[model samples]
Target chain A: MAKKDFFSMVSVDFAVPYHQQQLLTRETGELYTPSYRVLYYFRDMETGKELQVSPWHDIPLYVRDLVRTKPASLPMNRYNFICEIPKWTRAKFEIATGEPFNPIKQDIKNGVPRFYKHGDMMWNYGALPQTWESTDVVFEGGYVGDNDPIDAIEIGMTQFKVGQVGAVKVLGILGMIDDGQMDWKVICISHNDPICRFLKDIHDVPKFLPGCLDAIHEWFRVYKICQGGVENKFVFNGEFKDKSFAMKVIDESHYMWGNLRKI
Target chain B: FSMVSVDFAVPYHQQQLLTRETGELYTPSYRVLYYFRDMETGKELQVSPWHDIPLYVRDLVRTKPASLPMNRYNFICEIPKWTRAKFEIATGEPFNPIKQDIKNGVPRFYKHGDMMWNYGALPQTWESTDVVFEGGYVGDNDPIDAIEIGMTQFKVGQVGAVKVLGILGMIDDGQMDWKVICISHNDPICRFLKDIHDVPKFLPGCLDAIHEWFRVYKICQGGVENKFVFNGEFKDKSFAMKVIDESHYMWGNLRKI
Candidate 1:
């Protein structure tokens, strides 16, 4: 077999804790907090087939808002976001964000959220390309809970870089509520086995993403919460948790804001 | 496992001479003869050291002038000459054949043909003698046990003298024949005969004597039956004269005329 290509890239919103209120504005030209979508797409390289889009369901307007935030102050404003994509029959993907269309609007006679008239309020206009060659890579997404502060967020892909080199460009948004933190962290891995090849290099490096609250939710049915202290609770996932999806963000004290991160 | 029939023939004179004098006809003589038969075939034969002939015959043959041929009377006179005392001096005290002066004294008993010549004689008159061939003692002083006396060639008269002198003088060593003839009645002899014949009996000493004599004579003269004659009677009348196979008779007994 030919050696597979190796490539990885991650983008996190380091500005989430600073501008949590601005992300929820309508006329202020920003998306809302506690609601966003992160769209992901995978393509088959050889067949040029658009394999799938993230979430594989109706795109929630909130999920769209979360992935489309770009502030003028931030360099590479589209770097922090994650999305889930379902399996498809295509060979390549044309990954682009859409305007956050409200399902509630389809039922209302004349309801208008101020951000609805903003043409570029919810999504980025350009598409990023990705192709899949092997079945190893998978996509997954998470929502920031209402009370949870996004100190940072990370986007992950499993086994996508089977063949290729260098880094692929990434673009997305980060949005949050007015009282929560919205910092972000991102990581890429090539080694599929449990032991991380880059572990030593990254061990002391501080993460800027929020802890994985969504993975905790998905794995809650098999997890336990042990009280480590009066206010510090240690959450442990069960034996069956997909450990490859479990990740952590460090330096959360730096993002003591009141919003979730978007990237 | 196989049977062999041997026919034997001897010269007529040897047979006749052996038969007449050695047969049971003459008693009170120094030696006697007995006869026997192979019961299966009724073949007859003689036992030896025939004692009836006198010892003078033995002496005359050795010492007399050539003019005097051996006769019965001189044979009888020679008997007393072989006394214990004379025998001791003639043969030296121990009577050892190797040490004894045999040339100057009476000859050794087996040397002069004494037993054969004397015992092979013809009877003088048959009316005066009957064949007392019973298995018993002979002399009054000596209980001549049939087993011992019958099994050897020394005369009844010479038994004590010969035993004491321990030698036979001037007699025919031919009594080797006598010893062989009487081997049939010897205890060991008959045991051997019984094995050959497949017979079961305590073979009496007389019977062993009869058997030994016939065996020696038959072997020496080269035949067994009817080789001898007397005054018209078969000398070995006990039917001991056996026709050996189809060629000869073994004279197992002898007689005197």
Candidate 2:
């Protein structure tokens, strides 16, 4: 449906929780937060429609994955990393199977899907599900926002398990509104991620970092450079902010929670 | 040690492995990540550990090292009456001394087995095991190996709360290594404990992280080198175990079951 046309006819609700369900007004003509979902299912040509993985679901606190009695699914609201690609494999996850397969080759040069061909996701990377910019947090660009949940960057050394969740400590941010979405890249350290336990801030990057941050920024900056026309580009707000900024981004997220898939 | 790197632990072969390949990482069971990283030494290393078999494999055998208070490296468990008597086999140049003991019924295993591997300081473990459970009476007791794991060295000094990650493998009999035993889910230093030698199948094709993970932390050792000594008592021991089903094991396909 068209964006404005869809917004023209609307419903408002002042009731929440379990007591009742009703609209406050048919149309308020005033700004308000709408029901939102951060993640969107993507159908990879080879990997199929991958499930929308989220920080709330994928990351865990203290529960171990190898134990016999642990629950069989990712828990909600925790921070942890899962899976690692060998330096050589320069790999990423298969998502669904948690296998270290199909890593974006570091030294290659390609277009469209195969964005940057150099550097690794040195900091373990993952997405938070059920979080959206809400189409409420509008931006200055022609687009209001891509409307996706924030992504995270881990500055520790452990090769985290892909598709698994654990624990983490937020330290800072590498803020960037990608494709118009407030894609806040929260900085973190996997609490028990072995190599990462020593780090306290981002300044430690030059000494302990595997893939230079400059490399990471370049990769993210140029990833979608050529695809949406030569003029299409994303901004890189240079500087790693404090942890406070990161926590706020997570707060602006969305959750189409509950077991039900769609309304 | 001057360095260490990404310390993610995935359980495999009954222990977690850092999979690093340099320096002196203390070896307890060839599984504690081979967890030792001393006051000086950055690169990680561990491939072979056999002298401490009695202590290392106790978990596999369900025996306690401290209780046994003895070091008996070679314990000969016969190849079973079914295979030895039925085939009545005979072969020239035996594969190993234990094989010879089985064939000739001689006690030469303790004296001449694993000679090629027992080179080095041969570190001491918790203590000794009263008995080695090589699955003697259990039917279909395949060889259960209790050896030092990948990152045992990264965790060698003064003991306290340790954090651990487990890499599942093609098989697991539910044995917890020393690191995993003393491990606390919320332990603080677990950050230095993550890396990959998890299981060979799961290990990223490299042991490079420990170098960086080691180098950074080694210097943090500061003026005095920290020593991590870990001694744990399980208070319970009994029974022999064999891989009942490889498919449904901890390392099995988590998707199916």
Cα-based TM-score, every candidate:
0.14, 0.34
Q: What is the TM-score of chain A in candidate 1?
A: 0.19
* Interface RMSD values for all candidates: 80.0, 30.3
Model 1 RMSD in angstroms: 65.3
The window of 10 residues in a row where model 1 chain B has the poorest summed lDDT is B162-171
List candidate 1 segments past 4 Å from native.
A1-48, A55-178, A181-198, A206-263, B1-257
- Writing each residue's lDDT as its tens digit, candidate 2 over B34-115 gives 2212113333333112111221112111111122232212111122211221111011212111122232443222221222
Candidate 1 docking classification: incorrect
Model 2 deviation from native, Cα RMSD in Å: 23.8
lDDT of residue B106 for candidate 2: 32
Over the stretch B132-211, how does candidate 1's per-residue lDDT look in tens digits?
11122111110011112123343322211111000011101121111101121212333233221222234344333333
